[PDB]
Structures are given as structure tokens and as C-alpha cells.
Design a binder for these strands. Sequence first.
DNA 1: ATTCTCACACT
DNA 2: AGTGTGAG
Length: 426
Amino acid sequence: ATGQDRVVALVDMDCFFVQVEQRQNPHLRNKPCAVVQYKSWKGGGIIAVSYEARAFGVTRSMWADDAKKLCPDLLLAQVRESRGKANLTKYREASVEVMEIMSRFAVIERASIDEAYVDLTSAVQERLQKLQGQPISADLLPSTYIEGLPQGPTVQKEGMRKQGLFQWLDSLQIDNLTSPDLQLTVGAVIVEEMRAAIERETGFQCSAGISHNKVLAKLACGLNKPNRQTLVSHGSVPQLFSQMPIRKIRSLGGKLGASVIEILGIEYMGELTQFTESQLQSHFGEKNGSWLYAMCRGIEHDPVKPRQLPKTIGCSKNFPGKTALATREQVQWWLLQLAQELEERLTKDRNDNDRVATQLVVSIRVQGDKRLSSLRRCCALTRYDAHKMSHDAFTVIKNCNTSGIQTEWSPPLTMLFLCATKFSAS
DNA sequence: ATTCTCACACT
DNA sequence: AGTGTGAG
Ligand SMILES: O=c1[nH]cnc2c1ncn2[C@@H]1O[C@H](COP(=O)(O)OP(=O)(O)OP(=O)(O)O)[C@@H](O)[C@H]1O
Ligand SMILES: [Ca+2]
């Protein structure tokens, strides 16, 4: 098994929240700009950055005041706020615009508010038979890069792209409808069409990767951004992985990836090929070890899930520093604000998607604790009523209050979280 | 003191 | 059910 059975793409909207704001406010187009939340603290936290501003060093996680030091002419758009918290509706609605367009071409897996995996295997098979056996012109691939080409015996970027594409298409075996490289190329043709449709019908640009699985497609998508697509063939994997830091591969960006590096004494994905599957299973567990053994050879089997809608709907707010909640009536009021935005989104979900959540997950963070969450408790979600959820959420957390007072909350809360789960068809 | 979602493995 | 990891 060479892991070449499928054609999978990953589409990523370029600096998505910035694009939504630039479409709305033309004064922001083709300018260094960023999208910010919470204007009062250090000018707002940056959550999205246009490519013109990235050339000044502006990134996410930065404070707007700091970003303005790197880029004095940075323009800012601020996220809507509703009931004291950032409100992402505008961006979720734009996300829906794009996913509905993608769904015309293939079945998609929503991966995040601005990326989707695309399973193109069947679409490719139908384009191949409609294609008689005539050649794929480079005109059908006007923004595609072939990873690893050109090679062998031009100083500008578009020149290189074309030379790589010409070498690929020259050597393509169009008479063999079962060559995986041919299937990828047809897949790339379809993704060009899908990206043209997205830009025509929404004004939004995106990048894409086309490969044989989700991990290679995601890696490919990042190789030539913005507004370009990249085909990573099975054959391109040994050279690509030979200098690819382990942490770049999806799921290895964290503690497991650091353990792979430290325990094995390696730096690059390709270096994993020298270990047996049992060796990797002994260090990292049966599942992780088998996964790493196949993945360093370019092979991964995670399916594209036919799922365009999230499985949970959640509402959280952080209260860092001196703003940590300290009174019972503070905690009730913020629980109510979260439960009100949750009710709004749930009722829209019951009208748009014909389902009802049935479990309510309540989570809190305590000043001094270390982790994303300190505690998770659940109860039934029987009615989409903000006052009832918020009452119920308090009920299941009210005993975490270590204070002997009834009107004080010790120790102070640095996060409230409400999440609706366990949907059933309605 | 960036923040906020959402998915899944493990137990 | 509750915790921990990883991602956009
Ligand atoms: O580190 C994060 N903490 C919280 N939330 C994040 C983070 N990272 C990403 N998000 C969310 O996921 C959207 C698009 O995530 P993204 O990585 O695809 O970033 P962009 O499209 O802006 O730029 P690209 O680099 O893709 O061109 C972001 O706006 C935001 O909603
Ligand atoms: Ca993106």
C-alpha cells in the first residue's frame, strides 16, 4: 500500500477575517490591516493579519498597540462585540457562503471557520472519463505549483511556477486513467475551478493543497500562499520530508512532536523512516507509532468526514488578572451573558440545521490554576432558554466556591465556559 | 493579559 | 462522565 488511493484537498481562506472586513470596507483593500478584538487593553488583540502587514512583522496574538510599532500605517477593523464578548457571527456567516460553494464540487469536511478538507476521488474519476484521453493544458492550472519542480539541467516567481508545471505536464501519462499522479492533476484542475467559483461568488481568495491525504494536503496548502495552490505528489515526499521539521506535520506541533524529536534524536520528518514500526510503537504507543511509521512514508488514512456543521456549540469568556470574577452576582451575570449568546446561536441552529442539543457542559477556570480548564460539569439542556441554562450552569458549579461567605466567590474565576453538546435530529 | 472555538483520545 | 492534547 502506497497511500495513493484518494485525492484530497485542503482549502484555506487567506487571512480570512481580514478578507471579510476588506470586502465590506473597500478602504481597507490592498492595505496593511488587521482584525482586532477588545479595543481597550493595549489597543485590542489581533486575530487576523493581511499579507501586506505580515511583511512588517505583524502577527496574531500581538496587541494592536505593539503591531503599530512595527507597522505605523496599520489599519484596523474591530470585531463586533455583543454582551461583553467578541461576536464572530459575521465570519461564521461568510464561512457558510464559501462552504456551500465548495459543496457543489465535492463532499467537504469543515475543519475550522476558514478551512475545509475536500475528498475529490469520485469527482476526479468523472472528469477523467469526460476527458476522453486528451491532454491537460497548462491553461487549466493557472495558479498551481508542482512541489519539487522544476528540477534538473528563470529568476522570477511566475517563471519558476510555469517551468515546474510544464515539466510535470510534459511527463504525464494521460493514457493511464489509474496513475495516481494523473488523478492528482485532475484533482488540481477541479480545485482551480472551485477556487475560481469561490472568488467569483464571494470575492474571497484562498490557497489550497492537493495530495493523497489530509496531512499532505494541509502541508501542501502552506507551501505557496496567498491565492495559490500546490500539488504534492507521492513521489515528492522523500525530498520534501528530508528537511521538513517534525513540528510542521499536523498533530506533531505539540508535546508528542517534541517527544518524537527528543526521544529519537531527530529533527526532520524523513528521518523517521529508519525506525521499525515496532520501535515507534514502543516509544509512542500502538496508534501513534503505526501512524508515524506510515506518515513519514507519505501515507495516512484519516477519512474526509462528510460533515459541514460543528458537533458542539460553545460560548466562553476569559477574565484575566484583576478582572477575575469575585462575587456570586458577578458569576451569575456573566453566566447569563454567555447563556444568552448561546441561546441565540442554538435557536438559529435549530432553524437552519433541524437538530436540538440535549446536554449542557459548564466549565470554569480558577485563579492560580495552570490549565485551559479547571473543572468540567454537565447537566441536561431541555429548553433553549438563557435564564434556565445560566441558572442550571450555576447550580452545577456553585459548590466549587471555597469561600464560606454566600455573597463572595473564592477563589476568583478566570474563565466561564458553556457548551451545548449531544445533538439529536429535530 | 491576546484571546476563543471545536475535535478527539484516554480513562 | 471528566481530563488532556492539538488545531484553526
Ligand atoms: O492561535 C489562535 N488562537 C485563537 N484562534 C485562532 C488562532 N489561530 C487561528 N485562530 C482562528 O482561526 C481563524 C483563521 O485561522 P488561520 O490560522 O487559517 O489564519 P488566517 O486565515 O487569518 O491566515 P492564513 O495564515 O490562514 O492566511 C482565525 O482568524 C481565528 O478565527
Ligand atoms: Ca486561513
